């Protein structure tokens, strides 16, 4: 049905590998570099973050100081000098490793909106929020790189595998099948020819003899 033509195509299917085999190999370790390289950013990512999380935690906890109780007050009493929420300005990083959104939510998180320095803990503490926002970005943006870096590798190998693990030997066995038949044809010829010789020789036995 759908198998060979049976013939001469052999050469193309010989060339199958030329295309396949040679290209596809190499593709693997290309990006391997980038994933390797990813890690520097990952390492650095949380570095300051965790540090300055605890130096966040200062202010959080210094809420409770004389303003645990005025947390209640504060949550109104300080809240709105700035847009709360969004300003997420979606960013492309466009590479092999496609494009996904990253972003800087580049709107401020603010902190001054009140006078005197008002209740006090407030201002410096509100200032801590900066050091949430800003800092969170590092990781926000390194992990989106991560997701890129997952994909490739995974996807990659999926084909690696495929090539290695179906393609090549399948097409091998084709050629052979072909070959062999073609080849065996030689014989038939010969088989015929043999008899032909037999004829020529029979003629030559009983036309020279008789």
Can you tell me which of 21, 106, 157, 180 binds another protein, judged by CB under 8 A? 157
Instruction: Rank residues 97 and 178 by Cβ distance to another protein and give the closer one.
Output: 97
Q: Which range in 12-20, 24-32, 47-55, 57-65 contacts another protein by CB under 8 A?
A: 24-32
Q: Is 125 exposed, middle or buried (0-12, 13-18, 19+ CB in 10 A)?
A: buried
Q: How many residues bind another protein (CB under 8 A)?
A: 10
Place of tokens 């202010």: 59
- Between residue 31 and residue 90, which ones bind another protein under the rule CB under 8 A? 31
Q: Is 121 exposed, middle or buried (0-12, 13-18, 19+ CB in 10 A)?
A: buried
Distance (Å, rounded) from C-alpha 190 to C-alpha 204? 20
Instruction: Rank residues 95 and 200 by Cβ distance to another protein and give the closer one.
Output: 95
Distance (Å, rounded) from C-alpha 56 to C-alpha 124? 11
Can you tell me which of 3, 96, 206, 207 binds another protein, judged by CB under 8 A? 96
Of residues 36, 50, 56, the one with CA closest to residue 139: 50
Distance (Å, rounded) from C-alpha 36 to C-alpha 26? 17
Instruction: Rank residues 10 and 146 by Cβ distance to another protein and give the closer one.
Output: 146
Instruction: Rank residues 11 and 36 by Cβ distance to another protein and give the closer one.
Output: 36
Binding site for another protein (CB under 8 A): 23, 26, 30-31, 95-96, 154, 157-158, 161
């Amino acid at each position: 049905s759908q198998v060979s033509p049976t013939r001469m195509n052999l050469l193309q299917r010989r060339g199958q590998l030329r295309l396949a085999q040679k290209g596809v190999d190499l593709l693997k370790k290309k990006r391997d570099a980038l994933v390797a390289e990813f890690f520097g950013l990952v390492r650095e990512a949380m570095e300051a973050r965790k540090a300055l999380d605890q130096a966040a935690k200062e202010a959080y906890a210094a809420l409770l100081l004389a303003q645990a109780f005025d947390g209640p007050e504060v949550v109104a009493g300080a809240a709105l000098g700035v847009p709360p929420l969004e300003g997420v300005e979606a960013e492309v990083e466009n590479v092999w490793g496609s494009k996904v959104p990253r972003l800087k939510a580049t709107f401020p998180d603010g902190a001054l909106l009140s006078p005197v320095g008002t209740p006090a803990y407030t201002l410096e503490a509100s200032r801590a929020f900066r050091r949430y926002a800003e800092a969170l970005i590092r990781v926000a943006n390194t992990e989106t790189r991560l997701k890129k870096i997952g994909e490739e590798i995974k996807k990659t190998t999926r084909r690696v595998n495929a090539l290695e693990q179906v393609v090549i030997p399948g097409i091998r066995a084709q050629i052979r099948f072909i070959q062999q038949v073609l080849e065996q044809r030689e014989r038939e010829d010969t088989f015929r020819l043999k008899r032909i010789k037999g004829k020529i020789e029979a003629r030559e036995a009983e036309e020279e003899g008789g």
